[PDB]
Write a protein that binds this ligand. Structure first.
Ligand SMILES: N#Cc1cc2c(Oc3ccccc3OCCC(=O)N3CCOCC3)cccn2c1
Ligand SMILES: [Mg+2]
Lengths: 544, 405
C-alpha cells in the first residue's frame, strides 16, 4: 500500500550527520525481525543496502503475534524541525450536528506515504553469530521518526483535495490516523459517498475499515463520549484514600478540571492550594478541612451524570457567570435554556487581594478567549451585576478594560461594591494620623495613632514585619473610630493595598481591615511623605 | 524583474516560530479572501510541512473603510534579520523633521509588491490562517515578494525610492522626507493649504512613476510638558498633596523644598489653613523651577525607548517617554473629543505616541501598558490603523503617579 504521492524534502539540522548507534544481540526476536523485514521489503517499504559506509540506528522486537520497534532518538535529534502537527483539539461543544457521521481509520498510515529519496540513507538500520548484518533502509515514513506526523497529515490533506471539491456537501475532519466524515444527506446516499472515498483513498494507498464504517456511536474520542445528539465526558473515578500524595492530588485535580467543562459547579481551589508544597512528587500532603469538603461537594456533582449539546450556528451564543465564593466562579455557555454547550470555572486571584468586579471582569475575559477559539465568535454575556455597579468601577479603575454588551440578571449573590472610599476628606470628622514600625531583627513591632482631638495609642505587636504593622496601624484607627474617619498614613505600601478596594484577600489582617471598612460609612485615606515633618506625622513617628 | 538582493540572517540565528493568535470568523474569512487574491497575483505561495516558521497575521481596517486589510507581526523576524539588515542596508534618520511646522504621512507600502524577495529567505516569512476550533491546521503561505512590515522591505527598495524622489527633492530643497517602514514623512514650513498642495504634488509625482498611495501633524507644539501646581483660593489635606507632589518632583529637578511648617502640629484634615510669606515664597520659587526644564537628558541611540502611560480619567491619558527613570525625553497628554471605549483610547494613544517617536528619534518605543495582557491581545486589532506594531508589555502597579501627572 505504498503511494505515488509527491514526497516532501527533508534536511538534517545544518552541520549534523546521520546517526550511528550500533546494535547488539535474542534468537527468537532476531528471527521475528527477519520475518517482518522481508514481508515489509516485499511491499517496498524498506530496501536492502550494500554497506557503502552508511549510517545506523538501533531496532528491537517485542511480542504484543510479534511487532517491530526502532529507536530513532538519535536521528530525530539531527533532523530539521517541521510545522507543529496539532497543538490543540476540536472541542465537541463546537461541532455542528450532522445526521450521519462516519468514523474511518487508516491502517499503516505512516507506511503508506513515501519518504524522500536523498533522506533515505539516514534511516539505515541493521539486524554475535558474526551476523551478516542484513542492512536495510526505510522507503516510507518510519514510525517514531520526527517528521512522520507532520508529513503524513500533509499528504493525507492533498490526497483529499480532489474528493472534497467533488463532494462539497460532506465534511471531513482530520485527526492523526483517523477521518471523521459527516453529512446531512440520506443514510443511503451516505453509505455510498463513504464507499466512494474509501476506494479513492485506496487508489492512493490508504486502507480503511471493512465491516461497513465499523465505529458505531457513542464514540469514545479523546476522553469524550459523543452521542449522535449529546456529548459528555468519559466517566470519572475520584479515588477514596486515607493518605494523599502529590502524584495523587495532581491526578485528582486533573480529573476535576477535565470534568469542569460539562459538570457545572466544580471547585478546585483549596485542593490545588495543597500543591504549593510541590517540593516533591511522592511527599504525603495531609488534606485540609476545606479540601476534604471541596472533594466531597465534587463527589455530589458527579454522582448524577449530565451531558452537553452541540453547536447550531443559526442560534445565538450565550454566557452566564455565577459566583461560588473564596474567589471561585462558574460559567455556562448555551444556546438553549436547558441545553448547555459547555461549562467551566474561573478562580485565579491574580495576586493576594482582589475584588469581586475585577474577578468578574477577568472571568468574562477567559470566556471571550474560549468562545473565540471554539466557535469563532464572542457571546452575549448575562451578568449578576448592576450597570450602576460596573460603570462606577471601571470609571475609577486605574487599568483599562473592555466590558462587552451585557444584560443584567437578578439571581443573587449579585456582585456589588461593598464600600467606596471617599475621594475627598470628611468635614469635622476625626482625622487619625497613623504609623507603625517593627525592628525586622527583633521581628517585633508597634502600631499607633495620634488624632486631631488629641487621642494617642500604641499597641505592641509580636512576630510582625514593618509592612504588617503599618496595616495594623490602619486597622487600629478604624476600630477606634466613628462611622466617618479620615485616616492618614506614611506607608506607600498600605496605601496601595487599600486604594484598590479589595473585598476579598488572603491575609487575615486585610480581611479584618475589610470588615471594618464595610462597617464604616465615610472613610477617606490620604497620604503624606514619610519622615518629612509634615506636622502630626512627626508625632505618630515619635511614638512607634 | 529585478535581482533578488541577497538576504541573510544575523549569524547563528534561526527564524521566527511565533504562534498564531486565534481569530474570529469574520476576520478569518477576510484573510482567506485576501490571501486567495494574493496567491493569484503570485505574491505569496502555499508551503509544505518542511517549513517550521510562522509569524502572526491580523485583520484590521484601512483608514475607516469597509475594506478589510491584512497586517503581519514581523516583530520577531525583524529582531532576527533586520538588526543586521539595518546596518548592511540602513536608512539614516533626518534629525530636523521634528523642527518643521507641519508633517504629513504617506502610505507607500504598495511599492514593495513590485520587488521579488530573495529565494532562500522566503521560508522565514511563513504565516498561517488559523481555523476555528482546531477543525483544520491552518492554511500556510510564505511570501514571494517584499512583504510590508518587514523592515528589510523598505531597506531593499531604498535605492528605487531615492530615484523616484530625486526630481521632487531637488525642485524643493526645503522639504524633509523620511521613509520609516512603509510610510513617508514629509515635513515643511508652508502654510497648511500650500503644504497640502506641495503634498498633492508629491502624491501625484509618485503616482505617475508607478507608486500608488491611498494625517497632518505639527511637531512644534510638542514640548516636554511641565508640572502644574494647583491654584486654590488651602486645607491641611491640600497642603499635604502639595508637600507630597513637591517631594516627588524634587527627586528630579534639583531645587524647591519649610512649607510643612504651615501645618506643624496635629491639625485636622479639613482645617482651612492660611498662606505664609515664606510659604508663598517657596510656592512661587517652586512654580518657576518647574516651568524651567532640566539638563542631562540626552537620547542614547544604543538604549531602547520606554513609554509609560497612565489612565487619568474622563478620557485623559498621560505618557512619559524615557530610557532612564526620571530622565524623561518626551512628555505629553492625550484626550479624544463619544463611543470612546477605554481600549480604543489606549490604541489611539499608543499609535499617537509611536508616531511622535518615529518623527523625533526614528525608532519606536516599547510600551508599559496599563491593561490586562489577555484583554489587549484580544481587542488591540480593532482600532489599529497603522502598518507597524510596537513592542509592549503590561504594568500592574501605578501607586500615586496618576495624581502626580
Ligand atoms: N470517534 C470519533 C469522532 C467523530 C468526530 C466528529 O464527527 C464529525 C465529523 C464530521 C462532521 C461533523 C462531525 O460531528 C458533528 C456533530 C455530531 O453530530 N456528532 C454526532 C456523534 O458523532 C460525533 C459528533 C467530529 C470531530 C471529531 N470526531 C471524532
Ligand atoms: Mg515612619
Amino acid at each position: 500500500p505504498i503511494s505515488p504521492i509527491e514526497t516532501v524534502p527533508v534536511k538534517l539540522k545544518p552541520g549534523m550527520d546521520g546517526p550511528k548507534v550500533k546494535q547488539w544481540p535474542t534468537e527468537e526476536k532476531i528471527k521475528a525481525l527477519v520475518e517482518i523485514c522481508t514481508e515489509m521489503e516485499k511491499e517496498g517499504k524498506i530496501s536492502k543496502i550494500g554497506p557503502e559506509n552508511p549510517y545506523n540506528t538501533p531496532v528491537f522486537a517485542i511480542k504484543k503475534k510479534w511487532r517491530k520497534l526502532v529507536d530513532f532518538r538519535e536521528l530525530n535529534k539531527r533532523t530539521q524541525d517541521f510545522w507543529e502537527v496539532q497543538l490543540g483539539i476540536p472541542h465537541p461543544a463546537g461541532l455542528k450536528k450532522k445526521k450521519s457521521v462516519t468514523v474511518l481509520d487508516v491502517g499503516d498510515a505512516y507506511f503508506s506515504v513515501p519518504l524522500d529519496e536523498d533522506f533515505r540513507k539516514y534511516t539505515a538500520f541493521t539486524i554475535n553469530n558474526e551476523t551478516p548484518g542484513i542492512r536495510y533502509q526505510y522507503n516510507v515514513l518510519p514510525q517514531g521518526w520526527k517528521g512522520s506526523p507532520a508529513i503524513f497529515q500533509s499528504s493525507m490533506t492533498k490526497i483529499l483535495e480532489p474528493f472534497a471539491a467533488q463532494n462539497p456537501d460532506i465534511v471531513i475532519y482530520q485527526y492523526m490516523d483517523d477521518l471523521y466524515v459527516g453529512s446531512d444527506l440520506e443514510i443511503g446516499q451516505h453509505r455510498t459517498k463513504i464507499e466512494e472515498l474509501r476506494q479513492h483513498l485506496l487508489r492512493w494507498g490508504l486502507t480503511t475499515p471493512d465491516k461497513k464504517h465499523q465505529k458505531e456511536p457513542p464514540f469514545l474520542w479523546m476522553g469524550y463520549e459523543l452521542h449522535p445528539d449529546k456529548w459528555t465526558v468519559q466517566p470519572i473515578v475520584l479515588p477514596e484514600k486515607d493518605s494523599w500524595t502529590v502524584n495523587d492530588i495532581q491526578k485528582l485535580v486533573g480529573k476535576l478540571n477535565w470534568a469542569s467543562q460539562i459538570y457545572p459547579g466544580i471547585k478546585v481551589r483549596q485542593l490545588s492550594k495543597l500543591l504549593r508544597g510541590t517540593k516533591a512528587l511522592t511527599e504525603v500532603i495531609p488534606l485540609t478541612e476545606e479540601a476534604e469538603l471541596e472533594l466531597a461537594e465534587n463527589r455530589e456533582i458527579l454522582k448524577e451524570p449530565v451531558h452537553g449539546v452541540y453547536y447550531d450556528p443559526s442560534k445565538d451564543l450565550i454566557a452566564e457567570i455565577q459566583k461560588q465564593g473564596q474567589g471561585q466562579w462558574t460559567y455556562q455557555i448555551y444556546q438553549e435554556p436547558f441545553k448547555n454547550l459547555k461549562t467551566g470555572k474561573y478562580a485565579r486571584m491574580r495576586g493576594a487581594h482582589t475584588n469581586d468586579v475585577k474577578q468578574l471582569t477577568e472571568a468574562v475575559q477567559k470566556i471571550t478567549t474560549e468562545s473565540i477559539v471554539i466557535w469563532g465568535k464572542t457571546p452575549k454575556f448575562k451578568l449578576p451585576i448592576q450597570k450602576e455597579t460596573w460603570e462606577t468601577w471601571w470609571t475609577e479603575y486605574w487599568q483599562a478594560t473592555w466590558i462587552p454588551e451585557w444584560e443584567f440578571v437578578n439571581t443573587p449573590p449579585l456582585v456589588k461594591l461593598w464600600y467606596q472610599l471617599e475621594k475627598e476628606p470628611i468635614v469635622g470628622a476625626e482625622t487619625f494620623y497613623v504609623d507603625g514600625a517593627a525592628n525586622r531583627e527583633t521581628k517585633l513591632g508597634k502600631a499607633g495613632y495620634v488624632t486631631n482631638k488629641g487621642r494617642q495609642k500604641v499597641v505592641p505587636l509580636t512576630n510582625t514585619t514593618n509592612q504588617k504593622t503599618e496595616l495594623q496601624a490602619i486597622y487600629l484607627a478604624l476600630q477606634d473610630s466613628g462611622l466617618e474617619v479620615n485616616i492618614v498614613t506614611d506607608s506607600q505600601y498600605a496605601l496601595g493595598i487599600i486604594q484598590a478596594q479589595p473585598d476579598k484577600s488572603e491575609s487575615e489582617l486585610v480581611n479584618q481591615i475589610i470588615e471594618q471598612l464595610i462597617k464604616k460609612e465615610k472613610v477617606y485615606l490620604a497620604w503624606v511623605p514619610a519622615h518629612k515633618g509634615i506636622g502630626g506625622n512627626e508625632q505618630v513617628d515619635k511614638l512607634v | 524583474p529585478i535581482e533578488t538582493v541577497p538576504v541573510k540572517l544575523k549569524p547563528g540565528m534561526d527564524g521566527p516560530k511565533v504562534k498564531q493568535w486565534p481569530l474570529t470568523e469574520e476576520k478569518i474569512k477576510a484573510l482567506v479572501e485576501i490571501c486567495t487574491e494574493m496567491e493569484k497575483e503570485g505574491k505569496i505561495s502555499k508551503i509544505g510541512p518542511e517549513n517550521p516558521y510562522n509569524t502572526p497575521v491580523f485583520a484590521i481596517k484601512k483608514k475607516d473603510s469597509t475594506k478589510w486589510r491584512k497586517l503581519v507581526d514581523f516583530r520577531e523576524l525583524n529582531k532576527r534579520t533586520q538588526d543586521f539588515w539595518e546596518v548592511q542596508l540602513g536608512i539614516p534618520h533626518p534629525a530636523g523633521l521634528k523642527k518643521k511646522k507641519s508633517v504629513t504621512v504617506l502610505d507607500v507600502g504598495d511599492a514593495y509588491f513590485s520587488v521579488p524577495l530573495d529565494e532562500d529567505f522566503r521560508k522565514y516569512t511563513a504565516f498561517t490562517i488559523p481555523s476555528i476550533n482546531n477543525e483544520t491546521p491552518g492554511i500556510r503561505y510564505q511570501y514571494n515578494v517584499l512583504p510590508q512590515g518587514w523592515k528589510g522591505s523598505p531597506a531593499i527598495f531604498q535605492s528605487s525610492m531615492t530615484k523616484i524622489l530625486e526630481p521632487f527633492k531637488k525642485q524643493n530643497p526645503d522639504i524633509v522626507i523620511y521613509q520609516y517602514m512603509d510610510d513617508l514623512y514629509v515635513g515643511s514650513d508652508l502654510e497648511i493649504g500650500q503644504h497640502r498642495t506641495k503634498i498633492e504634488e508629491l502624491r501625484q509625482h509618485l503616482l505617475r512613476w508607478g507608486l500608488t498611495t491611498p494625517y497632518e501633524l505639527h511637531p512644534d507644539k510638542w514640548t516636554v510638558q511641565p508640572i502644574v501646581l494647583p491654584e486654590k483660593d488651602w486645607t491641611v489635606n491640600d497642603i499635604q498633596k502639595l508637600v507630597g507632589k513637591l517631594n516627588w518632583a524634587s527627586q528630579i529637578y534639583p531645587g524647591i523644598k519649610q512649607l510643612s511648617k504651615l501645618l506643624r502640629g496635629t491639625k485636622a484634615l479639613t482645617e482651612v489653613i492660611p498662606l505664609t510669606e515664606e510659604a508663598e515664597l517657596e510656592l512661587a520659587e517652586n512654580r518657576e523651577i518647574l516651568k524651567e526644564p532640566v539638563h542631562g537628558v540626552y537620547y542614547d541611540p544604543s538604549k531602547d525607548l520606554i513609554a509609560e502611560i497612565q489612565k487619568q480619567g474622563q478620557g485623559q491619558w498621560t505618557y512619559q517617554i524615557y530610557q532612564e527613570p526620571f530622565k524623561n525625553l518626551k512628555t505629553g497628554k492625550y484626550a479624544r473629543m463619544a463611543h470612546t471605549n477605554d481600549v480604543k483610547q489606549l490604541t489611539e494613544a499608543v499609535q499617537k505616541i509611536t508616531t511622535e517617536s518615529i518623527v523625533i528619534w526614528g525608532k519606536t518605543p516599547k510600551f508599559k501598558l496599563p491593561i490586562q495582557k489577555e484583554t489587549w491581545e484580544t481587542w488591540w486589532t480593532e482600532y489599529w490603523q497603522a502598518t507597524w506594531i510596537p513592542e509592549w508589555e503590561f504594568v500592574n502597579t501605578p501607586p500615586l503617579v496618576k495624581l502626580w501627572y
